[PDB]
Scaffold this active site. Structure first.
Site, PDB file in Angstrom:
ATOM      1  N   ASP A   1       1.129  -5.245  -5.459  1.00 36.95           N
ATOM      2  CA  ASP A   1       0.699  -6.615  -5.050  1.00 36.95           C
ATOM      3  C   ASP A   1       1.613  -7.792  -5.343  1.00 36.95           C
ATOM      4  O   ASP A   1       1.718  -8.183  -6.468  1.00 36.95           O
ATOM      5  CB  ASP A   1      -0.713  -6.955  -5.567  1.00 36.95           C
ATOM      6  CG  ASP A   1      -1.186  -6.373  -6.867  1.00 36.95           C
ATOM      7  OD1 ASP A   1      -0.549  -6.681  -7.849  1.00 36.95           O
ATOM      8  OD2 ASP A   1      -2.162  -5.647  -6.846  1.00 36.95           O
TER       9      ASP A   1
ATOM     10  N   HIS B   1      -3.346  -0.424  -3.617  1.00 38.82           N
ATOM     11  CA  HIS B   1      -2.084  -1.067  -3.967  1.00 38.82           C
ATOM     12  C   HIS B   1      -1.195  -0.213  -4.878  1.00 38.82           C
ATOM     13  O   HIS B   1      -1.730   0.358  -5.867  1.00 38.82           O
ATOM     14  CB  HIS B   1      -2.261  -2.386  -4.732  1.00 38.82           C
ATOM     15  CG  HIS B   1      -2.851  -3.449  -3.830  1.00 38.82           C
ATOM     16  ND1 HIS B   1      -3.799  -4.341  -4.171  1.00 38.82           N
ATOM     17  CD2 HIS B   1      -2.549  -3.704  -2.592  1.00 38.82           C
ATOM     18  CE1 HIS B   1      -4.075  -5.128  -3.153  1.00 38.82           C
ATOM     19  NE2 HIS B   1      -3.327  -4.738  -2.215  1.00 38.82           N
TER      20      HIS B   1
ATOM     21  N   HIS C   1      -3.468  -9.125   4.741  1.00 40.31           N
ATOM     22  CA  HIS C   1      -4.956  -8.950   4.930  1.00 40.31           C
ATOM     23  C   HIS C   1      -5.685 -10.095   5.579  1.00 40.31           C
ATOM     24  O   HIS C   1      -5.175 -11.166   5.834  1.00 40.31           O
ATOM     25  CB  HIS C   1      -5.542  -8.626   3.526  1.00 40.31           C
ATOM     26  CG  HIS C   1      -5.078  -7.413   2.805  1.00 40.31           C
ATOM     27  ND1 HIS C   1      -5.927  -6.375   2.520  1.00 40.31           N
ATOM     28  CD2 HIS C   1      -3.888  -6.979   2.270  1.00 40.31           C
ATOM     29  CE1 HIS C   1      -5.326  -5.463   1.930  1.00 40.31           C
ATOM     30  NE2 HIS C   1      -3.994  -5.800   1.733  1.00 40.31           N
TER      31      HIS C   1
ATOM     32  N   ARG D   1      -7.347  -5.249   6.487  1.00 43.01           N
ATOM     33  CA  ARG D   1      -5.990  -4.771   6.528  1.00 43.01           C
ATOM     34  C   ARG D   1      -5.779  -5.294   7.988  1.00 43.01           C
ATOM     35  O   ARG D   1      -6.173  -4.495   8.912  1.00 43.01           O
ATOM     36  CB  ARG D   1      -5.895  -3.339   6.482  1.00 43.01           C
ATOM     37  CG  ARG D   1      -4.929  -2.564   5.698  1.00 43.01           C
ATOM     38  CD  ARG D   1      -5.410  -2.471   4.311  1.00 43.01           C
ATOM     39  NE  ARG D   1      -6.240  -1.401   3.883  1.00 43.01           N
ATOM     40  CZ  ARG D   1      -5.715  -0.359   3.208  1.00 43.01           C
ATOM     41  NH1 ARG D   1      -4.412  -0.452   2.948  1.00 43.01           N
ATOM     42  NH2 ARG D   1      -6.470   0.737   2.782  1.00 43.01           N
TER      43      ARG D   1
ATOM     44  N   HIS E   1      -0.476  -4.970 -10.148  1.00 44.20           N
ATOM     45  CA  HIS E   1      -0.064  -3.615  -9.756  1.00 44.20           C
ATOM     46  C   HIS E   1       1.382  -3.772  -9.426  1.00 44.20           C
ATOM     47  O   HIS E   1       1.733  -4.941  -9.131  1.00 44.20           O
ATOM     48  CB  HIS E   1      -0.783  -3.129  -8.513  1.00 44.20           C
ATOM     49  CG  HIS E   1      -2.239  -3.313  -8.220  1.00 44.20           C
ATOM     50  ND1 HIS E   1      -3.071  -3.817  -7.262  1.00 44.20           N
ATOM     51  CD2 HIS E   1      -3.115  -2.794  -9.240  1.00 44.20           C
ATOM     52  CE1 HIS E   1      -4.350  -3.575  -7.719  1.00 44.20           C
ATOM     53  NE2 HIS E   1      -4.439  -3.022  -8.808  1.00 44.20           N
TER      54      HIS E   1
ATOM     55  N   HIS F   1      -5.575  -5.360 -10.678  1.00 45.39           N
ATOM     56  CA  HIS F   1      -4.949  -6.388  -9.928  1.00 45.39           C
ATOM     57  C   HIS F   1      -4.383  -7.474 -10.830  1.00 45.39           C
ATOM     58  O   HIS F   1      -4.611  -7.391 -12.028  1.00 45.39           O
ATOM     59  CB  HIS F   1      -5.937  -7.153  -8.984  1.00 45.39           C
ATOM     60  CG  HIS F   1      -5.247  -7.585  -7.704  1.00 45.39           C
ATOM     61  ND1 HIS F   1      -4.179  -7.135  -6.972  1.00 45.39           N
ATOM     62  CD2 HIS F   1      -5.736  -8.624  -7.016  1.00 45.39           C
ATOM     63  CE1 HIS F   1      -4.020  -7.914  -5.871  1.00 45.39           C
ATOM     64  NE2 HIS F   1      -4.941  -8.798  -5.891  1.00 45.39           N
TER      65      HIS F   1
ATOM     66  N   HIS G   1       0.977  -1.139   0.000  1.00 45.05           N
ATOM     67  CA  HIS G   1       0.000   0.000   0.000  1.00 45.05           C
ATOM     68  C   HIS G   1       1.008   1.175   0.000  1.00 45.05           C
ATOM     69  O   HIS G   1       1.861   1.269   0.888  1.00 45.05           O
ATOM     70  CB  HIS G   1      -1.066  -0.164   1.077  1.00 45.05           C
ATOM     71  CG  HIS G   1      -2.022  -1.281   0.776  1.00 45.05           C
ATOM     72  ND1 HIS G   1      -3.229  -1.008   0.195  1.00 45.05           N
ATOM     73  CD2 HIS G   1      -1.989  -2.660   0.950  1.00 45.05           C
ATOM     74  CE1 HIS G   1      -3.877  -2.156   0.032  1.00 45.05           C
ATOM     75  NE2 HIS G   1      -3.151  -3.179   0.494  1.00 45.05           N
TER      76      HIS G   1
HETATM   77 CU   LIG Z   1      -3.787  -5.083  -0.205  1.00 43.31          CU
HETATM   78 ZN   LIG Z   2      -3.876  -5.263  -6.001  1.00 40.30          ZN
END
Ligand SMILES: [Cu+2]
Ligand SMILES: [Zn+2]
Ligand SMILES: [Cu+2]
Ligand SMILES: [Zn+2]
Lengths: 153, 153
Positions: A83, A63, A120, A143, A80, A71, A48
């Site tokens: 990630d 992200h 997460h 999170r 990303h 994603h 993040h």
């Molecule tokens: Cu995340």
């Molecule tokens: Zn992501």
């Protein structure tokens, strides 16, 4: 240069000192480390963008995106630049992390130092989840623990 | 268009927010914060190098010192890099703060993101008070809280 760090923690009763070691110019961040307390199963394991641990794990941002991608898992090109993976907590959740990504760096560009690493709560949908809430995050609910990727030795 | 933040958390009552604004490639840097529950009048306000915070404030080592200078004065010629001096905790120990210093730049070579900023327990005496000690760490005493400089909002 050198070996990053990050120690995760938050209102989650979970936690974890997580490590990052990366040699040759750009290219393969070696991330290994551990994280306790959690609930077995898969867990999303992201970066993040904003290293604001300002007010929890809210501030970390979505992200890490350099030119806005949707994603992906680590294995794709639809992903990303933040990630990394999903990570498994087995029983009595020693989720022993090991990873070897080539996108996220340690010195230039895909600069993750002073960025946040979030582990997460829900299990990562990895893209493949055919809804917009996955392309956004990959569907991984809270999170639960987070920390800033600082600088150890 | 750099920005940065630092939630100065320690495990005494001491809980802080503090940030760095600074632009146009070699524009000086700024700090504005809210330090808390800190003992009256004068405290140490440093930035120690390895943003390892595994063992909270103590894995952050020496002040950010690339150079191998002796202890820093808020403005000496011969100042750590990481010591920015002292701060004033108005009676009940709230320390509204502000710094503009030359040296604590965050980009084109010398960036301090991924490092720790620790606020010291006692009255920081500039170093020049000749003692290879006072020059180590400005006769400051504990590290009562820390945070990592990361890219902020
Ligand atoms: Cu995340
Ligand atoms: Zn992501
Ligand atoms: Cu210090
Ligand atoms: Zn110093």
């Amino acid at each position: 240069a050198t070996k990053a760090v990050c120690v995760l923690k938050g209102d989650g009763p979970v936690q974890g000192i997580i490590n990052f070691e990366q040699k040759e110019s750009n290219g393969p961040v070696k991330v290994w480390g551990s994280i306790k307390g959690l609930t077995e199963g898969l867990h999303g394991f992201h970066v993040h963008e904003f290293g604001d641990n300002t007010a929890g794990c809210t501030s970390a941002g979505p992200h890490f995106n350099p030119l806005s991608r949707k994603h992906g898992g680590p294995k794709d090109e639809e992903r990303h630049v933040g990630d990394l993976g999903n990570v498994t907590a087995d029983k009595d959740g020693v989720a022993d992390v090991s990873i070897e990504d080539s996108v996220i760096s340690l010195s230039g560009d895909h600069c993750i130092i002073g960025r946040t690493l979030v582990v997460h709560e829900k299990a990562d949908d990895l893209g493949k989840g055919g809804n917009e809430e996955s392309t956004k995050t990959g569907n991984a609910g809270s999170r639960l623990a987070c920390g800033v990727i600082g600088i150890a030795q």
